């Protein structure tokens, strides 16, 4: 559900406020197979839950950081 | 459907949970005493 919301916001809201939104849709299309159940992100997250961290690990912290820097990747494009 | 099984299931859940809690705390204590690991705030409280 979180992945779906992230992808929908990427394909809907431009980062500037359109070429930016077209880049967003293309990037969302590329990352779509990874953002799925039993995908790369899900397995990586459930594995990271087994590692030790300086602070307590929360799923949404990692997900929000990931979405932030993916938005930055779109900005870089 | 067995109330007895429900009660014993709750009991074993609670007992096991507190069991690994205590065992992990004691393991951390013995590692601290051997100098293997640093003493944390929770570990400081537990030792004191």
């Amino acid at each position: 559900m979180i992945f779906n919301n992230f992808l929908a916001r990427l394909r809907s809201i431009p980062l500037d406020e359109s070429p930016m939104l077209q880049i967003q849709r293309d990037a969302a299309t590329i990352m779509q197979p990874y953002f799925t159940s039993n995908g790369l992100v899900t397995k990586a997250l459930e594995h990271a839950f087994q590692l030790e961290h300086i602070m307590d690990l929360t799923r949404l912290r990692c997900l929000g950081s990931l979405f932030s820097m993916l938005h930055q990747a779109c900005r870089n494009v | 459907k067995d109330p007895l099984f429900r009660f014993f299931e709750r009991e074993v859940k609670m007992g096991a949970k507190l069991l690994q809690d205590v065992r992990q705390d004691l393991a951390d204590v013995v590692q601290v005493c051997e100098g293997k690991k640093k003493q944390t705030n929770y570990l400081r409280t537990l030792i004191n």
């Binding site: 559900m1 779906n4 919301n5 809907s12 929360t58 799923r59 | 459907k1 109330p3 009660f7 709750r10």
Partner: protein, 242 residues
């Protein structure tokens, strides 16, 4: 020494249930009470211990009040459906041909299921079957409310679902929260950080606004972000001004 003190520790729950089911019009009030009070005792001392569980006199009182309301609305619905299907409405047979046990189970489910953790629900239903054999609970399916929820979810990029589909549990929680909102004037959403609570109540508020035509205004207050004086108010120590 200026007060006479009285210890009231154990209220007479069974008598309260008996009398206040007898008054509401339940003919099997004795059996209903003798089945419902031990059911609450069993819920208290058979389900998993959680900090957000209450099975005291307040819960039973709310259950019985909701049971009376549900019986009234079922009688109204039976009258309405009979009038549009024929002319045979009389109070005697409607009262006689009325599933009081089903009404009580419906009220109990509507008020207790939302508070339960995932693994306790089968225990609750097994207890209900043991104490109320044969009686089943079938929640009404709110078509218009679900449609409004789906529209709001699409508008705000939320993942609406139904049944076992992805997001079905979230919509179930929203519907349960709506039911409790109707029943209670005090609500509390317990759950780990980022379980969808904020978005759940926001979506429900928007759906209610679009459905009933009365628009909802929500004031969000962080009680611990300010001192209690700034939260409730101050009585001026010198001028006695509030």
């Amino acid at each position: 020494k200026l007060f006479r003190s009285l210890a009231m520790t154990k209220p007479d729950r069974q008598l309260i249930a008996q009398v206040m089911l007898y008054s509401q019009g339940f003919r099997t009030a004795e059996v209903l009470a003798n089945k419902i009070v031990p059911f609450f005792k069993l819920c208290d001392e058979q389900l998993s211990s959680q900090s957000h569980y209450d099975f005291g006199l307040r819960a039973l009182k709310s259950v019985l009040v909701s049971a009376g309301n549900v019986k009234r609305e079922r009688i109204q619905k039976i009258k309405r459906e009979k009038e549009e299907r024929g002319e045979a409405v009389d109070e005697g047979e409607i009262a006689e041909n009325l599933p009081e046990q089903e009404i009580l189970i419906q009220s109990v489910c509507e008020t207790m299921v939302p508070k339960l953790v995932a693994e306790d629900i089968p225990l609750l239903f097994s207890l209900l079957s043991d104490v109320f054999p044969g009686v089943q609970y079938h929640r009404g399916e709110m078509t218009a409310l679900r449609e409004e929820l789906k529209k709001v979810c699409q508008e705000m990029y939320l993942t609406y679902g139904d049944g076992e589909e992805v997001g079905g549990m979230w919509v179930e929680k929203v519907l349960q929260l709506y039911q409790i909102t109707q029943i209670n004037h005090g609500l509390m959403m317990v759950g780990p950080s980022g379980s969808g609570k904020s978005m759940a109540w926001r979506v429900l508020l928007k759906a209610l606004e679009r459905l009933e035509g009365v628009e909802g205004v929500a004031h969000i207050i962080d009680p611990k972000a300010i001192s209690k004086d700034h939260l409730y108010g101050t009585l001026d120590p010198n001028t006695r001004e509030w």
